[PDB]
Amino acid sequence: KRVLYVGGLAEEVDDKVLHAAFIPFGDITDIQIPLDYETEKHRGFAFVEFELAEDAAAAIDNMNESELFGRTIRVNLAK
Amino acid sequence: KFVKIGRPGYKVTKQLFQIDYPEIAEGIMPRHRFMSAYEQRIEPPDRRWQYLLMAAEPYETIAFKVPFWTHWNRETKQFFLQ
Amino acid sequence: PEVRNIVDKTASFVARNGPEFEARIRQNEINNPKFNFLNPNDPYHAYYRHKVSEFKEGKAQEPSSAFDLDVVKLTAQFVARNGRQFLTQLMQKEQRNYQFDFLRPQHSLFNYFTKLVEQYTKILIPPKGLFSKLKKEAENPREVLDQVCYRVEWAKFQERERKKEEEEKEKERVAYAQIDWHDFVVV
C-alpha cells in the first residue's frame, strides 16, 4: 500500500502526469493509466506506486476529488 | 412521487467543490456521487464522460463532468466538499 | 396608483381573511365598483386575486506477553513523570543506546501505551492516590447507587443517540438512493 489508485485520468494524462501529480509526496517508482487498447485514451483508472507509504497516503488523502484538464480525478486506496 | 422539481440552479465553483444554496429546513444533507453518462432521455453518442453530482432538496444540484469528505453549513447555507 | 392600491388592499384583506370575506364584502358593496376588483367587474380581478396569494404566502410587500506488558508498565511510569512536552525520562530512553519499541505512535501499541498513561494519570490525580483518599467509595454504597444510576442514565441517552443516528443515516441513504438520476448537467 505505497501507491495512489487514481480513477479519472483526463485525456492529456500520462504516466508522467500521474507521477508528477503524486511525486511531491513521494518518489513514484511505477506508474501507468489503464487504457482500453481500442482507443489509446486513458479511461480513468491509474496506478502511481511510489516508495513511501506516508507520501502515497497523504497524497491519496489530500488530492481526493480534484480537477485536472477540467476533469475530476480521484486518488484513493490502491488494493 | 412528492419530488417537486422547482428548477433552482447550482451556483458552485470547482477548484474542492463549493456551492451556495437555500435552506430547505430539513435534516437531509446533500448526497453526492460520480457515475457514468449512460442514463438520460436522449443519450447522445460519445458517452464515456461521467456525471459527478451532489444533489439535495432545496437547490438545483451541483453536477458536472468527472472523467465523509464534505459537509453543508446549515446556519450559513453553504456547501463544501473537499 | 388607485387600481393598484385597490388590488393590493383587497390582497391584504384576502391574505388575512380570504375569499369568504370576498363573497361577503361583494354582497355588501356590489352596488358600486369599489368592490369590482373583488368581483368579476373590474380589471383588477386577476391582479387582485393573485396579489392576495402573494401577500399571504410571502411574495408581496405591504402596499405603499508479560515481558511486553512490563515494558508498557515502564512506559506508563515514564509518562507519569514526564513533566515537559520536550523533557522527560523517556527522551533519553529513545536514543540512549537501547531498544525503544513502544516509543512509536504509528505502532498499535501506542494506543495501549496511551491507555496505560490514562491509568497512570488516574493514579496521579491527587484525588486518585497521591495524598488524599475519599471514603465515599470505601464505605459508600449510596454514592455507589448514585453512580450506578448515573451510568444507567448515560446508557439511556446513548441508546437514544444510537437509534437517532441509525435512523438519520438510513433516511440519508434512502435519499441518495432516490436522488436526481436523470437530469445530470453542469453550469
From Swiss-Prot, chain A:
Found in all the examined tissues including heart, brain, placenta, lung, liver, skeletal muscle, kidney and pancreas. Changing residue 47 to D: Abolishes interaction with KMT2A. Abolishes inhibition of KMT2A activity. Changing residue 35 to A: Decreased affinity for KMT2A. Residues 2-79 form the RRM domain. Changing residue 43 to A: No effect on interaction with KMT2A. It comes from the Eukaryota. Belongs to the cyclophilin-type PPIase family. PPIase E subfamily. The RRM domain mediates both interaction with RNA and with KMT2A (via the third PHD-type zinc-finger), but has much higher affinity for the KMT2A PHD-type zinc-finger. Involved in pre-mRNA splicing as component of the spliceosome. Combines RNA-binding and PPIase activities. Binds mRNA and has a preference for single-stranded RNA molecules with poly-A and poly-U stretches, suggesting it binds to the poly(A)-region in the 3'-UTR of mRNA molecules. Catalyzes the cis-trans isomerization of proline imidic peptide bonds in proteins. Inhibits KMT2A activity; this requires proline isomerase activity. This is Peptidyl-prolyl cis-trans isomerase E. The chain holds residues 5 to 83 of 301 of the full protein.
From Swiss-Prot, chain B:
This is Splicing factor 3A subunit 2. The chain holds residues 108 to 209 of 464 of the full protein. Belongs to the SF3A2 family. Component of the 17S U2 SnRNP complex, a ribonucleoprotein complex that contains small nuclear RNA (snRNA) U2 and a number of specific proteins. Part of the SF3A subcomplex of the 17S U2 SnRNP complex which is composed of three subunits; SF3A3/SAP61, SF3A2/SAP62 and SF3A1/SAP114. SF3A associates with the splicing factor SF3B and a 12S RNA unit to form the mature 17S U2 small nuclear ribonucleoprotein complex (17S U2 snRNP). Identified in the spliceosome 'E' complex, a precursor of the spliceosome 'A' complex. Identified in the spliceosome 'A' and 'B' complexes. The modification Phosphoserine is found at residue 36. It is found in: Nucleus. Component of the 17S U2 SnRNP complex of the spliceosome, a large ribonucleoprotein complex that removes introns from transcribed pre-mRNAs. The 17S U2 SnRNP complex (1) directly participates in early spliceosome assembly and (2) mediates recognition of the intron branch site during pre-mRNA splicing by promoting the selection of the pre-mRNA branch-site adenosine, the nucleophile for the first step of splicing.
From Swiss-Prot, chain C:
Ubiquitously expressed. SURP motif repeats lie at residues 6-48, 71-113. The record marks 74 as: Critical for binding to SF3A3. Its main location: nucleus. It comes from the Eukaryota. It is found in: Nucleus; Nucleus speckle. GO terms for molecular function: RNA binding. The modification N6-acetyllysine is found at residue 9. One of its GO terms (cellular component) is U2 snRNP. GO terms for biological process: mRNA 3'-splice site recognition; mRNA cis splicing, via spliceosome; mRNA processing; mRNA splicing, via spliceosome; U2-type prespliceosome assembly. Keywords: Acetylation, Isopeptide bond, mRNA processing, mRNA splicing, Nucleus, Phosphoprotein, Repeat, Spliceosome, Ubl conjugation. Component of the 17S U2 SnRNP complex of the spliceosome, a large ribonucleoprotein complex that removes introns from transcribed pre-mRNAs. The 17S U2 SnRNP complex (1) directly participates in early spliceosome assembly and (2) mediates recognition of the intron branch site during pre-mRNA splicing by promoting the selection of the pre-mRNA branch-site adenosine, the nucleophile for the first step of splicing. SURP motif 2 mediates direct binding to SF3A3. Component of the 17S U2 SnRNP complex, a ribonucleoprotein complex that contains small nuclear RNA (snRNA) U2 and a number of specific proteins. Part of the SF3A subcomplex of the 17S U2 SnRNP complex which is composed of three subunits; SF3A3/SAP61, SF3A2/SAP62 and SF3A1/SAP114. SF3A associates with the splicing factor SF3B and a 12S RNA unit to form the mature 17S U2 small nuclear ribonucleoprotein complex (17S U2 snRNP). SF3A1 functions as a scaffold that interacts directly with both SF3A2 and SF3A3. Identified in the spliceosome 'E' complex, a precursor of the spliceosome 'A' complex. This is Splicing factor 3A subunit 1. The gene is SF3A1. The chain holds residues 47 to 282 of 793 of the full protein.
